[PDB]
């Protein structure tokens, strides 16, 4: 049975990282956030002014508005049987750039590089290169042949029990 305080149950959630106390980086306040970006809410207990609610810690959101000192963030919250849209304004000390689309942004550049050469190849009449293949789950491995000259054999059998004392 807990109390209904705003910051209840935060002995470990709001503790600073081991040997990570004191001031934060300078990149946190120098990073430029633009609308549509993906950010992560990470409450910094070192800064008690404007501390976001503990239910949003670790959530990934989207930047929807940039104010002079605060960055608008829009996350999703779960309610009785529905989902609502939460619009918060958080200073950059409590948010962090998200890497959720890091892998996707790599495929976008690989395709765009290929598409840039195709307009060159079609211009010069050469056949055009194909786009990279789509990601697939780890497929069944094909038939492979192992040479018989660089192979050693290790015999495997159940081990005789030995006392650990």
């Amino acid at each position: 049975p807990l109390s209904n305080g705003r910051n209840r149950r935060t002995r470990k959630l709001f503790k600073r990282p081991f040997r990570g106390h004191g001031l934060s980086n300078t990149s946190t306040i120098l990073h430029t956030y633009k609308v549509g970006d993906y950010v992560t809410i990470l409450c910094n207990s070192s800064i008690q002014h404007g501390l976001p609610y503990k239910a949003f810690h670790g959530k990934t959101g989207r930047v929807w508005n940039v104010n002079p000192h605060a960055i608008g963030v829009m996350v999703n919250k779960k309610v009785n049987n529905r989902i609502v849209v939460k619009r918060l304004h958080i200073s950059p000390e409590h948010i962090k750039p998200s890497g959720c689309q890091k892998d996707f942004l790599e495929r976008k550049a690989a395709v765009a590089a290929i598409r840039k050469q195709n307009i060159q190849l079609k211009k010069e009449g050469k056949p055009l290169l194909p786009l990279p293949a789509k990601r697939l789950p780890k497929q069944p491995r094909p038939a492979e042949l192992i040479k018989g000259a660089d192979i050693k054999f290790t015999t495997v059998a159940p081990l005789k029990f030995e006392e650990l004392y």
């Binding site: 300078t26 990149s27 306040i29 120098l30 990073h31 104010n67």
Partner: protein
């Protein structure tokens, strides 16, 4: 015996080192992040600071804006290049601090090309009164914050002689005229100290008292043949000669390697050699 040394591995396993530049005692990170914070709704628009640092021999002044990769220096003006403008000795005076700040203001506006419409004040009569660069036509002046570092801002400090020079140079540096050489007395006190009047009264005082004290304190002045009266006119020409050519100036360095590391072979060989000589 009784030691109780608090330096054991238990102490170090939890020790948290401060930031490297604060560990050196060169940066105040509590005040740096106040001057460094650009408004978030101004995306990547630079915020400029006048980094004023005074060493034992030179008055450094730079214009820097910060980035995640590091700090970038837009322009910089030193006092060791004042001999090119007619000031040979006393490179850290209140007068030389003014010349360094004035030179940076004119040198920067030349780089951006806005030196024609921003000229500041030039006559020696108006050296003592405050001047804030203002809007010309409809173009705002160049705004730049003052960065002082770990220097106490007293009511006569040199770091405000640099700031006063830039404002007279046409660069807008927000300020209040209560920490200049005045803030007490009037424009004549600020103007006289800007022209080395405080300097150009000590030798006149010292000569009346003693000759060895006069020689010990102003030895290089005596050899260079700079009278206590020529100081006022020397700084007038330095300001005049600055406004007509602030555009900086143009071998291979001679390195001096120091120790170099030891490879794993040399490091291991010595231990075996040390072990061999102990195989007492």
């Amino acid at each position: 015996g009784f030691l109780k040394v608090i330096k054991n591995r238990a102490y170090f396993k939890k020790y948290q080192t401060q930031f490297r530049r604060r560990r050196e005692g060169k940066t105040d990170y509590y005040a740096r992040r106040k001057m460094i914070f650009q408004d978030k709704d101004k995306f990547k628009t630079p915020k400029y600071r006048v980094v004023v640092r005074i060493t034992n021999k030179t008055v450094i002044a730079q214009i820097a804006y910060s980035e995640i990769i590091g700090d970038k220096i837009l322009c910089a003006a030193y006092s060791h290049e004042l001999p090119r403008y007619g000031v040979k000795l006393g490179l850290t005076n209140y007068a030389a601090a003014y010349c360094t700040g004035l030179l940076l203001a004119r040198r920067l506006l030349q780089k951006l090309g806005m030196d024609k419409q921003f000229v500041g004040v030039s006559d020696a009569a108006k050296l003592g009164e405050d001047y804030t660069p203002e809007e010309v036509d409809e173009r705002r002046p160049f705004k730049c914050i003052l960065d002082v570092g770990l220097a106490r801002t007293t009511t006569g400090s040199k770091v405000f002689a640099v700031l006063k020079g830039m404002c007279d140079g046409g660069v807008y540096v927000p300020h209040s005229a209560t920490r200049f050489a005045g803030a007490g007395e009037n424009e004549e006190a600020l103007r006289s100290r800007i022209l080395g009047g405080h300097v150009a009264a000590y030798m006149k005082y010292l000569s009346g008292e003693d000759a060895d004290l006069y020689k010990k304190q102003f030895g290089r002045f005596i050899a260079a043949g700079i009278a206590p009266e020529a100081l006022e006119n020397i700084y007038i020409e330095a300001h005049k000669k600055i406004r007509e050519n602030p555009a900086a100036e143009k071998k291979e360095h001679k390195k001096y390697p120091t120790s170099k590391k030891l490879t794993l072979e040399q490091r291991k060989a010595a231990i075996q050699a040390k072990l061999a000589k102990l195989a007492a």
